[PDB]
Design an enzyme around this catalytic site. Structure first.
Site, short mmCIF file in Angstrom:
data_model
loop_
_atom_site.label_atom_id
_atom_site.label_comp_id
_atom_site.label_asym_id
_atom_site.label_seq_id
_atom_site.Cartn_x
_atom_site.Cartn_y
_atom_site.Cartn_z
N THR A 31 -96.82 -4.06 -105.48
CA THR A 31 -95.64 -3.33 -105.88
C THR A 31 -94.82 -4.14 -106.88
OG1 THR A 31 -95.66 -1.97 -103.90
CG2 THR A 31 -93.54 -2.18 -105.02
N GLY A 58 -95.08 4.50 -122.03
CA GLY A 58 -94.18 4.67 -123.15
C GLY A 58 -93.54 6.04 -123.01
N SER A 59 -94.32 6.98 -122.49
CA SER A 59 -93.81 8.33 -122.27
C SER A 59 -92.65 8.30 -121.27
CB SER A 59 -94.89 9.28 -121.77
OG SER A 59 -95.93 9.41 -122.72
N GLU A 164 -95.33 2.90 -131.37
CA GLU A 164 -96.42 2.55 -132.28
C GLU A 164 -96.15 1.34 -133.17
OE1 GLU A 164 -97.03 5.93 -134.86
OE2 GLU A 164 -97.29 7.28 -133.11
N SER A 185 -94.63 1.03 -125.93
CA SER A 185 -95.80 1.42 -125.16
C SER A 185 -96.82 0.29 -125.08
CB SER A 185 -96.47 2.68 -125.68
OG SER A 185 -97.68 2.90 -124.96
N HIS A 190 -102.75 -0.49 -127.98
CA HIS A 190 -101.50 -0.53 -128.68
C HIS A 190 -101.38 -2.00 -129.05
CE1 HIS A 190 -99.38 3.36 -128.39
NE2 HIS A 190 -100.47 3.58 -127.66
N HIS A 217 -86.19 5.98 -107.53
CA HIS A 217 -85.53 6.79 -106.52
C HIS A 217 -84.03 7.02 -106.66
CE1 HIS A 217 -89.48 6.43 -104.56
NE2 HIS A 217 -89.38 5.12 -104.76
N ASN A 250 -89.54 8.06 -109.87
CA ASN A 250 -90.32 6.94 -109.42
C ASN A 250 -91.29 6.72 -110.59
OD1 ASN A 250 -92.02 4.92 -108.63
ND2 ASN A 250 -92.66 5.81 -106.68
#
Ligand SMILES: Cc1ncc(COP(=O)(O)O)c(CNC(CCC(=O)O)C(=O)O)c1O
Ligand SMILES: Cc1ncc(COP(=O)(O)O)c(CNC(CCC(=O)O)C(=O)O)c1O
Ligand SMILES: [Mg+2]
Lengths: 390, 390
Positions: A31, A58-59, A164, A185, A190, A217, A250
């Site tokens: 974790t 990256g999203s 990028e 990202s 990358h 959370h 999360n």
């Protein structure tokens, strides 16, 4: 042609990274913890930002970036607020805007830089513009100076999707550090790779706090006793450890990714170096190409890959080019997503508008292509490519 | 540094998992792929569902679960739609509702089962009710037969957050497969653990396909030639591979988790068998506790952990019990988050209402505690527990 000898992607790993995973395995702590934190610390250091937060991708970085603005004591963004974006970018650049109910104003790109068109941006910005979300395309940074001139000191948030262009610089400053927040990202292939992974940088402590909170959370567990979110944390864990303050997610990264990132960062200077040498070589070989234009560099680009735009009235057909490349073993793809505005089905869900037209984006959508750049010397691949593109 | 006589958590891994991780290393393919796919097939097969979609966490499973409802050709949910939820659950059960702009209706829990109070539900349901998001608490399934009687033909969507009850069954049916969709978590110390991980199950193809799309960039790459979102995928790769049709996210799991997941599923049955045997013993020891009430089992619980509620008019203070447990080397915690409704700060962001009252939830909040159950026999541990809780 389907046999690929000149691929878009490759591995940035070596022994060091495998050892790193090993260290994690031995630790038996998977974790998000020590490594992630250490990673974040070096990350900020590397780029020249006060804070850095690691996320699953990256999203997801983009997601939290947008979200964060809704939760400041004095919310910086509000539903229906106008945000300006370029017409060419990755899908997850746009999605969060939709998901947060923003009004999206699309702006054409500059055909040479591939970045937002400065001239159009000029007119696009009005009294209603609440934020500008820039994208450093293919390693090429935007001209921040000009951007700044446009804002002229107003209260318009500048944001950067630097997914990028890790390592790119402008005026000696690291791309991604220009905006209130910048995203990166570390996905496969990358500038660096941590399997999956992303990061958000910022110099704002409140935002920083909010991020820490929304990443996991909406709790206070990752917050410091004194924080900009809840002020002061109760000393009662039974209570304290169980309180939720913001509507988050999360999107925690894995420890492994953090441990890997550490090794990767050390190598960054070398990766950039190689990539840049390759670009130099490339520009030289394609300088006066009869029917293809190359990306026009701004500042020092981190050259993610190499774009080509079929010259106007060159009579050249993208389709053949592509065929040609493939048959020769050269892997190629559209320039990112091409004109994002073509995605009519997803757009149905957006509250948007287009400033003027997106002529250049349309041209690119039809005449652009791109081949890979690697942190490995490609002189030979480059000679061959030039040979193929005669 | 530990010094625990009775931990809340433990590892579920053996050499097999470590072996699996090795296997992935060797493969050099770290992005969601074959392993994830194998896992999903096994997963669906294990619980009796047609389809399974692995996500980065249980939290994101939830997120996608809500989202998917807005994307059906004939949208199942729309902003403002009323959704019912119990007052006790993890925070990520709620956020997505808020994030999608739904109208939240909190319903009290039953003090015995710890699940949604069936009687109140009856009253809570109106013609305005569009969906019921159930939660199977601590391994204990809801009484779906009754809930079903409640829905009584009406067009109400039934959903399940099965993040704590993997393995539970009701009427010979696996928890998570009762609702249109069901969510699961494979985070550390769950029934199974893949570092981080989540899964969604469904019997609906359209939903299945929607999930495939939004999990990864809202693209078509993970969609079959003939699918329910786009119908038929073009053959042109340079085009079809760069098309976005739904506003999703990037919540892909790592290939590693899926590899680990595969091994864990095999052990699942024993795990469950061991936990149930522990429960059997625990129950015998606490069945007639003078001041503590235990969880009332519905169907066949998977006994995530052991809950306790101080009996009314007992003169026993929770604070004092915790202290004792702690001095005793026994880890304890609140029952999940306790009464979620106490979270005023985060509630500010919600469009919610409370049906009747949450007296039960409030009672539990001040009078409940929880100790761990593991896939290892705890006979001695349970005995000691009973000794401490004299
Ligand atoms: C402008 C932009 N924003 C965001 C992202 C995404 O970060 P991430 O991939 O960690 O979600 C990318 C990269 N886009 C892709 C698409 C390929 C893929 O993720 O499978 C990339 O990271 O390669 C991007 O180019
Ligand atoms: C009802 C419910 N929904 C969703 C989740 C979350 O799944 P995930 O954690 O994979 O996002 C949990 C578990 N809640 C917790 C909180 C502890 C933590 O995540 O550190 C759990 O994973 O045990 C849960 O109990
Ligand atoms: Mg023993």
């Amino acid at each position: 042609g389907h046999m690929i000898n000149y691929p878009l992607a490759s591995s940035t790993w070596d022994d060091l990274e495998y050892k790193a995973i090993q260290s994690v395995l031995d630790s038996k702590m998977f974790t998000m913890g020590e490594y992630v934190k250490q990673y974040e610390t070096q990350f900020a250091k590397t780029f020249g930002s006060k804070y850095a937060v690691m996320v699953s991708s990256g999203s997801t970085a983009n997601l939290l970036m947008i979200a964060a603005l809704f939760f400041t004591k004095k919310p910086r963004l509000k539903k229906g607020d106008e945000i300006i974006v370029p017409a060419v970018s990755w899908s997850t650049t746009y999605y969060p805007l939709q998901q947060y109910g923003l009004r999206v104003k699309f702006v054409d790109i500059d055909i040479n830089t591939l970045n937002i068109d400065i001239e159009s941006l000029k007119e696009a910005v009005t009294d209603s513009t609440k934020a500008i979300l820039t994208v450093n395309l293919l390693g090429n940074p935007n001209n921040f100076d000009e951007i700044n001139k446009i804002i002229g000191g107003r209260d318009i948030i500048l944001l950067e999707d630097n997914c990028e262009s890790m390592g790119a610089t402008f005026n000696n400053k690291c791309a991604g550090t220009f905006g209130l927040m910048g995203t990166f990202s570390s996905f496969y292939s990358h500038h660096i790779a941590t399997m999956e992974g992303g990061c958000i940088v910022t110099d704002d402590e409140e935002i920083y706090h909010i991020l820490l909170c929304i990443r996991a959370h909406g709790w206070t567990r990752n917050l410091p006793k004194k924080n900009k979110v809840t002020g002061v944390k109760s000393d009662d864990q039974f209570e304290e450890s169980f309180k939720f303050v913001l509507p988050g997610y999360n999107v925690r990264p894995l420890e492994m990714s953090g441990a890997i990132g550490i090794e990767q960062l050390k190598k960054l200077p070398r990766f950039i170096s190689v990539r840049r040498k390759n670009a130099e070589y490339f520009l030289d070989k394609f300088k006066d190409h009869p029917y293809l234009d190359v990306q026009q560099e701004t500042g020092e680009s981190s050259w993610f890959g190499f774009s080509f735009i079929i010259k106007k009235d060159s009579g050249v057909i993208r389709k053949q080019l592509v065929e040609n490349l493939n048959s020769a073993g050269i892997e190629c793809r559209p320039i990112v997503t091409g004109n994002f505005l073509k995605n009519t089905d997803v757009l149905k869900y957006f509250d948007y508008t287009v400033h003027n037209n997106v002529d250049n984006a349309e041209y690119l959508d039809k005449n652009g292509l791109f081949v890979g750049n690697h942190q490995i010397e490609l002189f030979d691949e480059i000679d061959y490519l030039r040979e193929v593109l005669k």
